[PDB]
Curated annotation (Swiss-Prot), chains A, B:
It comes from the Bacteria. Belongs to the MinE family. Prevents the cell division inhibition by proteins MinC and MinD at internal division sites while permitting inhibition at polar sites. This ensures cell division at the proper site by restricting the formation of a division septum at the midpoint of the long axis of the cell. GO terms for biological process: cell division; regulation of division septum assembly. This is Cell division topological specificity factor. GO terms for molecular function: identical protein binding. NCBIfam families: minE (TIGR01215), PRK00296.1 (NF001422), PRK13989.1 (NF010595). Keywords: Cell cycle, Cell division. InterPro entries: MinE, MinE_sf. The keyword Zinc does not apply. It comes from Neisseria gonorrhoeae.
Length: 81, 81
């Protein structure tokens, strides 16, 4: 039912890894009509600024992937701390 | 497979509403051990600041819901423009 249940719908993961994990979904649902790009990477940058302040993680561990569906674009930012 | 397919796994929605929709997932996976709260609403505030700049939407249309699972907390921000 919950989006989080969709994230955790692969049985129980259990096991302690002693690490924190951020799952950030930035989904912008638009249309075939559109213009003036630069929204997902704009917020991404801001999030990386906040990251640099509080969360010491390198882009070597941060997974950045954008997925396109029709006129909808979503940015996935997975952060391992 | 994709998180976006999980978001759009309820058949095809089609129908044009001539409106934009943002689906923001801010998921912080931690543990029973933890302290110094105030991360989800901190980013939420920052996002609302960016919203006020670029995206003219009122909290009357913005859905704000936090979901707790064990030592994991996720904040869902749904914005209708």
């Amino acid at each position: 039912m919950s989006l989080i249940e969709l994230l955790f719908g692969q049985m129980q993961k259990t096991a302690t890894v002693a690490r924190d994990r951020l799952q950030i979904i930035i989904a912008q649902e638009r249309a075939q009509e559109g213009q003036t790009p630069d929204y997902l990477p704009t917020l991404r940058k801001a999030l990386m600024e906040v990251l640099s302040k509080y969360v010491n993680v390198s882009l070597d561990n941060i997974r950045i992937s954008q997925e396109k569906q029709d006129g909808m674009d979503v940015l996935e930012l997975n952060i391992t701390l």
